[PDB]
């Protein structure tokens, strides 16, 4: 029971993916296995503490062993690599509240929805968590991937600074109301007209502010004592973007200029979960990120730090809010969701999730997704998905996570009728 100074997490993962581009491009499917080793070190001395976690990965192909991985020349991952995941120092002595502390270094930033921040990033982050009042404030920026195989940052991350904060209160037992803010500022520059544009150039620079209000009733508490749980959130995105314009000239992309415009967009996510008994749960969700509008002003996007993974099905396992296969970003996207889940004590859980997805504006792209295929102008029907997650907890666990995506009319002729992405993870902690 003495404070544990080190450990090692060992994960074996298999991934089957077919076909991310729906058959539109060559190869690019996965059926592969890998091991991921994460040694960690922790020290604590009165109000001070410090932590390091590293990572070594070897796999048969470039599979996803980390749900929080950076998305990917200079950005080509290798089948095997080393990385530094977290390295930070923490000071808890500003106040006597044990849930209050200040953390500096590359660290896990997470809030419960996963929709604003859920990532490892260099940050200075203040947390204040007590029974009646929670608050946080921080700043973050990526300076490197800290990986042996990736030499450059993604253009969206380069020179982008994040500032954010939140504050919330438990106004009745198990019911929380709060506000949340995030601001992203780009100090980079766009290619100038006539310059060649490649995959490591920015497509835009922005100064963007998200302002959100969030109500939850054990939304993400898998151990809730209430028969009904819920989440409701509404988020306003404002600010501006300078968008790069380009043209094609001889199989090469050339910058032609740029266009600025204000953003005035809106996102909402609602959910209701029935705690039917000690084991069974089921629920419904609706979410929408606005799209299109006059000069793209209504195109909602997320912060870029989000995972969209959360305990929304009411289990210990986190699930992708917009599908393991589709992996939607809330951006010109409407989603309806139904789920059921089962758990037995701390020993097993399982969730079955259905989604239907539509575009909001049928002449605009959606944001990120786990699908790499062009949408047909004028078609709103993105598709449907069924997901299954099943876990046995032995510390250690073994989990199946799978999604089956059925493309709708927005994907069109010559695309596959079905696509899946599935994982098995076996994890042991020493
Ligand atoms: C701004 C980034 C800060 C990065 C700090 C990285 C911290 C690295 C490793 C965490 C553990 C350091 C422990 C150092 C140490 O000698 O601890 C004494 C320990 O043996 C018993 O308490
Ligand atoms: C230990 C506690 C210290 C608190 C330090 C102060 C933290 C400051 C701000 C936290 C809230 C995030 C700020 C969001 C923001 O400033 O941008 C909005 C603005 O750009 C709209 O145009
Ligand atoms: C209770 C039913 C579970 C619902 C399905 C959730 C599991 C998701 C994926 C399982 C792997 C299926 C892989 C084969 C398949 O169905 O599609 C073939 C297609 O991907 C060819 O491109
Ligand atoms: C308390 C002192 C000990 C600190 C822990 C040392 C652990 C060993 C390595 C930490 C990770 C340093 C990696 C830095 C790095 O990868 O450089 C990134 C490049 O600049 C690429 O942009
Ligand atoms: C502009 C009108 C917006 C009205 C929104 C009202 C939302 C009402 C109910 C949604 C769920 C609220 C739960 C409140 C609740 O259960 O707490 C009451 C206390 O537990 C009393 O013991
Ligand atoms: C397919 C590869 C392995 C991935 C699967 C990991 C989870 C495996 C099995 C979980 C089984 C879920 C049902 C458990 C059940 O019905 O009751 C458990 C018993 O009551 C306790 O022994
Ligand atoms: C021992 C278990 C090895 C396989 C674990 C599941 C990952 C594929
Ligand atoms: C024990 C559970 C068995 C079901 C696991 C499903 C994993 C997906 C493998 C499907 C591969 C088929 N194909 C040809 C589409 O790649
Ligand atoms: C059931 C869903 C998880 C898929 C597991 C993926 C298969 C792992 C082992 C087969 C791949 C190894 N190999 C030989 C193709 O490199
Ligand atoms: C456990 C499976 C580990 C597989 C990693 C090895 C892949 N490699 C480098 C040999 O092609
Ligand atoms: C000990 C072997 C370490 C191999 C590291 C992955 C390639 C860099
Ligand atoms: C602005 C972001 C502040 C991040 C400071 C954390 C230091 C971690 C290593 C950075 C080099
Ligand atoms: C198992 C822990 C390993 C920790 C060290 C990993 C950091 C190495 C990063 C080197 C980056 C080299 N690069 C990308 C500039 O070519
Ligand atoms: C509007 C501002 C809402 C979040 C403010 C957080 C303040 C830092 C504690
Ligand atoms: C929604 C705004 C909630 C902020 C909590 C501030 C009240 C403190 C008692
Ligand atoms: C959604 C529920 C909103 C409840 C707001 C808190 C009222 C407290 C008096
Ligand atoms: C406490 C936050 C509640 C957020 C609920 C948002 C629903 C907005 C529906 C669109 C109204 C026009
Ligand atoms: C209860 C209060 C909930 C506020 C939701 C209002 C949504 C309106 C969003 N919009 C379209 C005006 O930007
Ligand atoms: C599609 C999922 C939507 C929510 C499911 C609703 C669950 C209602 C369960 C009623 C069962 C009443 N019972 C069995 C406890 O006496
Ligand atoms: C596939 C297996 C899904 C998980 C089992 C849930 C139903 C067990 C009821 C006792
Ligand atoms: Ca392909
Ligand atoms: Na403290
Ligand atoms: Na629950």
Author numbering: 37 to 108, 117 to 438, 455 to 490
From the paper:
Briefly, the structures include 18 antiparallel strands (S1–S18) that cross the membrane to varying degrees, nine extracellular loops (L1–L9) and eight periplasmic turns (T1–T8). The loops and turns range in size from two to 43 residues, with L1 coordinating a calcium ion. Both the N- and C-termini are in the periplasm. The cavity within the AlgE barrel has been proposed to act as a pore for alginate, a random, linear copolymer of 1,4-linked β-d-mannuronic acid (M) and its C-5 epimer α-l-guluronic acid (G).
A number of different crystal forms were obtained, leading to several structures, the best having a resolution of 1.9 Å. The best crystals were obtained with 7.8 MAG at 20°C. These yielded three crystal forms in space groups C2, P212121, P21 that diffracted to 1.9, 2.4 and 2.8 Å resolution, respectively. In the AlgE-1.9 structure, electron density located toward the mid-membrane plane of the barrel and a little off-centre in the barrel cavity was well fitted by a citrate molecule. Citrate was present in the precipitant solution used for crystallization and is the likely source of the anion. It was not seen in the two other structures described in this study, in which T8 and L2 extend into the barrel with anionic side chains substituting, to some degree, for the bound citrate. We propose therefore that citrate acts as a mimic of the M and G components of alginate in AlgE-1.9. Further, its location within the 10 Å diameter electropositive pore serves to identify it as a limiting structure through which alginate passes in its transit across the protein and the outer membrane.
